[PDB]
Amino acid sequence: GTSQWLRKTVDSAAVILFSKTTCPYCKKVKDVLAEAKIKHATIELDQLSNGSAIQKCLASFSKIETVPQFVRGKFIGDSQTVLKYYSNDELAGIVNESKYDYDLIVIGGGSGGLAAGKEAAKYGAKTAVLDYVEPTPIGTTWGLGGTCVNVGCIPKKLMHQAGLLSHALEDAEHFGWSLDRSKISHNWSTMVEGVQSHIGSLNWGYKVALRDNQVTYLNAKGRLISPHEVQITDKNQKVSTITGNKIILATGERPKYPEIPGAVEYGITSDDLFSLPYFPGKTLVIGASYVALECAGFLASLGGDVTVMVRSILLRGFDQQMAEKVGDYMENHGVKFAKLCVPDEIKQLKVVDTENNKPGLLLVKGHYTDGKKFEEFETVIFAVGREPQLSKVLCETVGVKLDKNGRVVCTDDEQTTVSNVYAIGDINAGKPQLTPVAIQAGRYLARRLFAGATELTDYSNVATTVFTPLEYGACGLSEEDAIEKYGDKDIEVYHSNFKPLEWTVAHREDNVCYMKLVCRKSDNMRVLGLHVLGPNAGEITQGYAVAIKMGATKADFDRTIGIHPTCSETFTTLHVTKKSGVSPIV
Amino acid sequence: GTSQWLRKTVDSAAVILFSKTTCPYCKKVKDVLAEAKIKHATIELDQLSNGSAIQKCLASFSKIETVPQMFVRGKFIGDSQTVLKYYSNDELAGIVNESKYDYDLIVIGGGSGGLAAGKEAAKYGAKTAVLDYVEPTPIGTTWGLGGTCVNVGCIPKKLMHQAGLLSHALEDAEHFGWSLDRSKISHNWSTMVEGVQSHIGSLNWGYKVALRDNQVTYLNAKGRLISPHEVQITDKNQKVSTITGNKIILATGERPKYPEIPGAVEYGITSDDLFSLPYFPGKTLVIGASYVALECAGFLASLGGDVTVMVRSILLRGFDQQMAEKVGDYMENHGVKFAKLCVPDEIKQLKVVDTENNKPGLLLVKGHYTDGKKFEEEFETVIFAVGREPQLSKVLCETVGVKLDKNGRVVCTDDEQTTVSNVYAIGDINAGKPQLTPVAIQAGRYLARRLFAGATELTDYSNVATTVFTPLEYGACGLSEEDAIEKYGDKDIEVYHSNFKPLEWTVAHREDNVCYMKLVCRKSDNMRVLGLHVLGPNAGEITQGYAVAIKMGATKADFDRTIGIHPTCSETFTTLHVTKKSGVSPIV
Ligand SMILES: Cc1cc2nc3c(=O)[nH]c(=O)nc-3n(C[C@H](O)[C@H](O)[C@H](O)COP(=O)(O)OP(=O)(O)OC[C@H]3O[C@@H](n4cnc5c(N)ncnc54)[C@H](O)[C@@H]3O)c2cc1C
Ligand SMILES: Cc1cc2nc3c(=O)[nH]c(=O)nc-3n(C[C@H](O)[C@H](O)[C@H](O)COP(=O)(O)OP(=O)(O)OC[C@H]3O[C@@H](n4cnc5c(N)ncnc54)[C@H](O)[C@@H]3O)c2cc1C
Ligand SMILES: OC1CN(C(c2ccccc2)c2ccccc2)C1
Numbered sequence A: 001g002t003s004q005w006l007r008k009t010v011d012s013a014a015v016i017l018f019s020k021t022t023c024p025y026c027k028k029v030k031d032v033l034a035e036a037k038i039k040h041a042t043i044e045l046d047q048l049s050n051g052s053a054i055q056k057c058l059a060s061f062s063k064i065e066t067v068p069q070f071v072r073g074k075f076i077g078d079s080q081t082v083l084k085y086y087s088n089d090e091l092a093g094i095v096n097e098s099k100y101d102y103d104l105i106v107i108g109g110g111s112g113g114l115a116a117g118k119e120a121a122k123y124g125a126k127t128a129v130l131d132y133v134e135p136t137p138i139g140t141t142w143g144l145g146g147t148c149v150n151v152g153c154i155p156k157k158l159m160h161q162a163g164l165l166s167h168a169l170e171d172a173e174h175f176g177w178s179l180d181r182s183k184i185s186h187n188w189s190t191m192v193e194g195v196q197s198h199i200g201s202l203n204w205g206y207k208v209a210l211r212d213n214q215v216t217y218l219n220a221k222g223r224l225i226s227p228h229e230v231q232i233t234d235k236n237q238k239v240s241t242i243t244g245n246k247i248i249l250a251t252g253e254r255p256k257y258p259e260i261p262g263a264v265e266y267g268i269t270s271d272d273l274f275s276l277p278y279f280p281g282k283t284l285v286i287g288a289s290y291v292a293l294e295c296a297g298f299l300a301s302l303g304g305d306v307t308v309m310v311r312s313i314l315l316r317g318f319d320q321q322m323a324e325k326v327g328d329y330m331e332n333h334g335v336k337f338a339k340l341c342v343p344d345e346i347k348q349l350k351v352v353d354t355e356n357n358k359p360g361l362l363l364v365k366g367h368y369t370d371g372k373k374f375e376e377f378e379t380v381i382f383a384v385g386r387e388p389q390l391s392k393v394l395c396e397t398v399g400v401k402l403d404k405n406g407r408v409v410c411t412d413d414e415q416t417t418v419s420n421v422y423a424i425g426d427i428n429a430g431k432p433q434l435t436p437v438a439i440q441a442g443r444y445l446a447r448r449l450f451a452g453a454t455e456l457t458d459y460s461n462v463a464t465t466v467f468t469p470l471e472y473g474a475c476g477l478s479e480e481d482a483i484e485k486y487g488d489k490d491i492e493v494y495h496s497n498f499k500p501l502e503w504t505v506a507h508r509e510d511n512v513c514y515m516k517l518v519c520r521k522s523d524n525m526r527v528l529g530l531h532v533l534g535p536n537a538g539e540i541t542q543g544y545a546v547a548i549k550m551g552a553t554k555a556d557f558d559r560t561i562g563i564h565p566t567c568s569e570t571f572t573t574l575h576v577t578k579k580s581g582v583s584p585i586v
Numbered sequence B: 001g002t003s004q005w006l007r008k009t010v011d012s013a014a015v016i017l018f019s020k021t022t023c024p025y026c027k028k029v030k031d032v033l034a035e036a037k038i039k040h041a042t043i044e045l046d047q048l049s050n051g052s053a054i055q056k057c058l059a060s061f062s063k064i065e066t067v068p069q070m071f072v073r074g075k076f077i078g079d080s081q082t083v084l085k086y087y088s089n090d091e092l093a094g095i096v097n098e099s100k101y102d103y104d105l106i107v108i109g110g111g112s113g114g115l116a117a118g119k120e121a122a123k124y125g126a127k128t129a130v131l132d133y134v135e136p137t138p139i140g141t142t143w144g145l146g147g148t149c150v151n152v153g154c155i156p157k158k159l160m161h162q163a164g165l166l167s168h169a170l171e172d173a174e175h176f177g178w179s180l181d182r183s184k185i186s187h188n189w190s191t192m193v194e195g196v197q198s199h200i201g202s203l204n205w206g207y208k209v210a211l212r213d214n215q216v217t218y219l220n221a222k223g224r225l226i227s228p229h230e231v232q233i234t235d236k237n238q239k240v241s242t243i244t245g246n247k248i249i250l251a252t253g254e255r256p257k258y259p260e261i262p263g264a265v266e267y268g269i270t271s272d273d274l275f276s277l278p279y280f281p282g283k284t285l286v287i288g289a290s291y292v293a294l295e296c297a298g299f300l301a302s303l304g305g306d307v308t309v310m311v312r313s314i315l316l317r318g319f320d321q322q323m324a325e326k327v328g329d330y331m332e333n334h335g336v337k338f339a340k341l342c343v344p345d346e347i348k349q350l351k352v353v354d355t356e357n358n359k360p361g362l363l364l365v366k367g368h369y370t371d372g373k374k375f376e377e378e379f380e381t382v383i384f385a386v387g388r389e390p391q392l393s394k395v396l397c398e399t400v401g402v403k404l405d406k407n408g409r410v411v412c413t414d415d416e417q418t419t420v421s422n423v424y425a426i427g428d429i430n431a432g433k434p435q436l437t438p439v440a441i442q443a444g445r446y447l448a449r450r451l452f453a454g455a456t457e458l459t460d461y462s463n464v465a466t467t468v469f470t471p472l473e474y475g476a477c478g479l480s481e482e483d484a485i486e487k488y489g490d491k492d493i494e495v496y497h498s499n500f501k502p503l504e505w506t507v508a509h510r511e512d513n514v515c516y517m518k519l520v521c522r523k524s525d526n527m528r529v530l531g532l533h534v535l536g537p538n539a540g541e542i543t544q545g546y547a548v549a550i551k552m553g554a555t556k557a558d559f560d561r562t563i564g565i566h567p568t569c570s571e572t573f574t575t576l577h578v579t580k581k582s583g584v585s586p587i588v
């Protein structure tokens, strides 16, 4: 038991020191390692639940039981032995002795891979991270940091914010400011400049941060040819093979395209939208996911003429009453919808004018589910899902098992069917596809491999926010999911409309914002899911995700007092139930 | 045991029907009561844990143990047949109105807690009256039903706070690509006051209509407890009379103090006046350092005023002082001036307020610093924010026996009972309780439930979250750092902290390291979160949800294992790691 942990820890750690805080002979070793620039993990025996057993158990490797004791599985010595290697100039060569080039190779430099790399490096692991950005069909490309940094959460929430500031210009007049919203316009390329300027500063920050943790950054495409061999390819095409003890796969996903004529040739995806040199103009967004809705939302707030093509429903997998309230708000505020509709081909009427910086022109043809026809836009953005391309990363012969969708099947500690290879982030099968999830898995995984830790990532009840023009925050089950799992008779739902105080003087709507709490009667009225639609929904929801992790019930919400003038306080006084039939309005 | 609960409930309730859900004889009696428009509390016995024992105890009053049993003001009325005999004989309505006094409940004070108590008492059939009156300010300002928050507190102040934030929203819009020129935009104070006052007026009317449609008598009259059941009311027409009630709830709030210096009451104003002021204040001196004074000073600067705050000693006494100082440093860097360690001596009139052209006067303010050097500057407006106090002398005849602490607040047990057994107190006049509007609503709604419905839930007053609405907002829940260190000793306290920068501030070119958060934790108790603090945008919305986890005893581990929501400020709480003992820098 304790036997198996210690044998595991001593085998994968690069440089580890077993120690005590009060021990003086250990501080002498720490000081030598500190002085010689030797990074290492450290286990202070005197603060562990079974430090006595561990100390006795260490003798099985070192034939001693005292407490200043390891490099890559090999016992090195006590303080006397280590000082002697130090004095005689032998110490640096033993700590670099390795069967492989790196203790860890990370394939993919995004939210999870950068986070796993930086954490391993802190415990002495010799570490390389690989990153390469295959261009889009028109050639768009970007720098280190992954999908969120460059073409995901960071540029889309900045663009969300450009769009919110438009209603702030509307609201300012009613609070007494002299401006006239009706004679202000928005300049797209000015906005893209500021957004890209911030993205480039993150590109630079990550490069600076790997340099300062002594992580090798290879800007190269990687391929696992064998359990410890990674084939890399240069920007000059030069092919080479590096070796690593532990491999972490963290290569993420890219957007899909429908198999129709003109899709790849004349349409774009979100990959291209966030650095586009011209304003998209009259835009058709094809899709109904959060990417499609979020992008269609801010393009509308920035003045554009915007249509969304919906195959079946909005936001599949999320609570469908909230999805529809989200949709009704957008449809009431500009965004147009072609419902139960699908595209059949894109034809080109004008080519993109690179000179004068202008979009092209396109004819879009399709049909509705009843057969009726759909038939002009300047930009077509496809947002019809995302997928990994592991055939380009992972030679079949290696042995890494995949599920039917192309994602990696992993144990609950991120390990693949090949004992030294792990996977994190979007390509980990059945996990929430979110940046904060990728970062926590990567950091905890790196501590287990090189520092003796045991903590797992908890993937249950992870909160979300959809940054549509009115935001929608969620934590836990949807309403339909709770009923499907426990029966309607066992589910109680408390809900209420509300109106932000900032909307009163601005003459905004009375009962569009909405929140609800999905509970379980038989389990002391346990909160199964939380849903809020309104401004700052992400800030509202986060704090509640902690109490749900702790098993919060309706009583825990009742007995907590609200903070006044806020929207979030409405959760602390909810009382109208859906079965009561009472109206939720204010 | 259970028996003395049942007698407190039966003796106190107005109309109460002991029933069972499945019982068909009960459902017949419910509908008779619903038809004749007779409201009542209902205690379903098959949905309480030990209702079988209670059935036995009901015999102590009614000599039966059958299910349908109705009581009116402590008297057993009848079972199913007897209440149907009363109905068809034109007798039910006389028995249900049989009362020793005019009302079951008199609420003195129609503010946050009083209106809430009255509304919930009327639900369960209590004949309720709620008195409200607004003594005018020295310059004669006056307002309508609702209390201090609705008319001259949390509601107009956050709206003016909001007008102030839109200034920086207008600045940021240029950087996000909008064409406006912030330079050429100014503010109009009177246009703003009209909108805020319009929304207030709509709230005055909503409360009158809520009270009408709950069957609560609203008397616009000043009330005075003369005996334990007798309240004396004075009209707007100066007319005096005497009503009586079984239970009395005192909920009369507070008003702003003035310092005893020449000129103050004559030529100064307070918060009661600032939110309906017909003219813009102009160059303004705010005296004091509480959340009222900083919040008001903050939006006047944001609106474009020339503003000075006179601090006697420290900012935000009683709060976390590292946080208080970060608040004050932000303000000083964005145009609020402070006169530090300074106190006023007199206010001299130089010019009278021009009511006709709608312009302020001119004042001279003279005071002195602790170093002996003198203060002398002219100000168009001077606002005192130097505390708030109750005036129970005007409410409470000394002969009644309601005991008060040295400050003038009402001593109460943990269910709000005064030293006179039928009189309670809620809100700002309850001694030792957080003086906050949500607290006064929960106190009010829970007390009414206990008196007229047989509920037992108490108000929990510990760890009540707050938010100070300065230009950069400050949210807090729990103990401040110096309080935890004092209570447990410094070696038992660990503090995790971090600077942050909202994503919205990146393209807007705002500062990198002003926003800040910290968790104050107790080592020897599983790293228990003793207090949470955040300085930043939307601090109210950030803090609220964590108040639930803290009520539940959250630890640092519980914050670690919860995952963030990305693009948010609030997610920085889920990955804190730098400790103060460590001495590592918290910057970004
Ligand atoms: C438009 C959009 C908006 C989003 N908004 C949010 C949001 O608000 N909040 C949120 O939590 N999540 C959001 N997400 C999801 C978030 O981007 C992902 O969950 C996150 O990026 C997953 O991180 P990862 O490390 O698994 O993958 P990635 O960040 O994509 O990292 C993979 C990296 O590896 C590179 N790579 C691929 N193949 C190879 C190879 N063979 N060799 C070397 N390098 C390779 C890729 O080019 C890339 O740089 C959004 C996603 C999109 C598309
Ligand atoms: C400027 C300011 C800003 C504030 N901002 C906030 C904030 O953001 N959040 C927050 O939670 N709290 C805030 N507060 C505090 C909040 O206003 C109070 O905690 C709350 O109003 C207390 O409610 P109450 O029912 O105890 O008293 P009140 O609201 O004052 O109600 C008492 C009422 O009774 C009336 N009355 C008095 N004497 C008599 C009498 N003899 N007969 C009849 N009627 C009488 C009074 O005129 C008044 O209408 C603020 C306070 C101020 C001054
Ligand atoms: O024809 C049906 C209308 N449906 C969507 C819809 C509703 C409102 C606005 C836009 C779109 C929808 C369906 C289901 C969940 C949420 C929204 C497609």
Ligand SMILES: OC1CN(C(c2ccccc2)c2ccccc2)C1
Pocket (backbone or CB within 6 Å): B311, B313, B314, B315, B316, B321, B324, B325, B327, B328, B329, B332, B338, B340, B341
């Ligand atoms: O912004 C400045 C810092 N603020 C004061 C302060 C605020 C909180 C705690 C202590 C001190 C102050 C400083 C020095 C002398 C007197 C008061 C106002």
